RNA sequence: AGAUC
């Protein structure tokens, strides 16, 4: 557990805090209180806006500068502790701006495999190793460890079963015979949709959660009766429930670079040990409620090295300036997840500026931004959005998607490099259309 | 799938 001696420079501490152990409400304030009392310049790194808002509740009264609109409180201007999201921190590292010499980094949910989160751990662990700072990584599943069944406040009954992944008419009575409340983790919104429809037809009250619907629907899980919550992995962080059962597909959808040539979003993919632990962690939370159950449908990924986020993290980190043109390494227990030599993706000054702007203003995925920038294309030159090979044609309602261009032409979307993330749902496609049209 | 400005 935490002790003030961990706040010394050159010290990286990983706090293994199992789900429900009090990471945010108990441990985080203890650390922050000690940093403030010693006026240690500190950044708290929240994985998401949702979690940042939860942190403010835990830290309320303590002087923290919240560098996210997810929180609105009155800053005094003398606070020595900053709070921001993982991605915000990494974005600011890429900008030609002053990022403080934080002497302490506190990273919540340090298993998070968002590319910005991975890159942040590399930067941070590198600064600690160089003796410039201390860091505390907090998570139920520290990088390098593979326990899908961590500790819990109450013992959990773990059972591997055949979990249905499509609507069913028979053969899975145990699903609907349950008289309690179930949280069901699915790999995609569309998959969730089908399962939810099946459950609703069977007379169940279902609430569905995903990034798109979370803000409104999660509140309903607190205020309405429900039999099932059918949720994507949005609920692996920042979400808790009063339930006695988790059903876990043990599957996910994550971007993968195919043949080094394009990015796909491919199913089926097994979840990681860390994600399985987060999912299971939704129950067994109350010592007064024994008997919670975790029903899971298969194994975890032996490795997630095929996930695009590892290479993308190195693309980010290769372009973050440290000192003297030094380049930070990935956090050691994670470093072998990418085989590229250190520096492989470092861009020269002008191409690097383009890469950064393509992500920050363009909202493009790291991999795609890198392709465009390394090709020597300028940020505002959108011709590449239309001159790919035919198999890169983007479809909308199974007919080719079209854009009115900056030059008043209606053209078919056909990007020179194909990244499935620019068109994987309506919002992504709308965003990419506006980019192709030169409108941001 | 998820994620920030």
Residue numbers in the entry: 178 to 617
Quote the study on this structure.
The NS3 protein plays an essential role in viral polypeptide processing and genomic replication, with a protease domain at its N-terminus and a helicase domain at the C-terminus. Upon RNA binding, the helicase domain exhibits intrinsic nucleoside triphosphatase activity, which then provides the chemical energy to unwind viral RNA replication intermediates to facilitate replication of the viral genome together with RNA-dependent RNA polymerase (NS5). Given its essential role in genome replication, ZIKV helicase could be an attractive target for drug development against ZIKV.
In the structure of the ZIKV helicase172–617 in complex with a 7-mer RNA, the single-stranded (ss) RNA runs through Domain II to Domain I in an extended conformation with the bases stacked against each other, separating these two domains from Domain III. The 3′ end of ssRNA binds to Domain I, while the 5′ end mainly interacts with Domain II. Domain II rotates about 9° away from Domain I in a rigid-body rotation mode along axis II in the direction as noted in Fig. 3B and 3D. However, Domain III rotates about 9° away from Domain I in the opposite direction along axis III, which is approximately parallel to axis II. This rotor domain rotation caused two α-helices (residues 365–379, and residues 390–400) in Domain II and two α-helices (residues 525–537, and residues 602–615) in Domain III to move away from the RNA binding groove in an opposite direction, enlarging the groove to accommodate the ssRNA. Additionally, similar to the DENV helicase, the ZIKV helicase binds to ssRNA by a positively charged tunnel identified along the domain boundary of Domain III, which directly interacts with Domain I and Domain II as well. The specificity of the ZIKV helicase for RNA relies on multiple hydrogen bonds between the 2′-OH moieties from the ssRNA and the carbonyl oxygen of D410, side chain oxygen of T265, and six water molecules (W1–6). However, to our surprise, the exact RNA recognition mode differs markedly between these two structures due to the distinct motor domain rotation upon ssRNA binding.
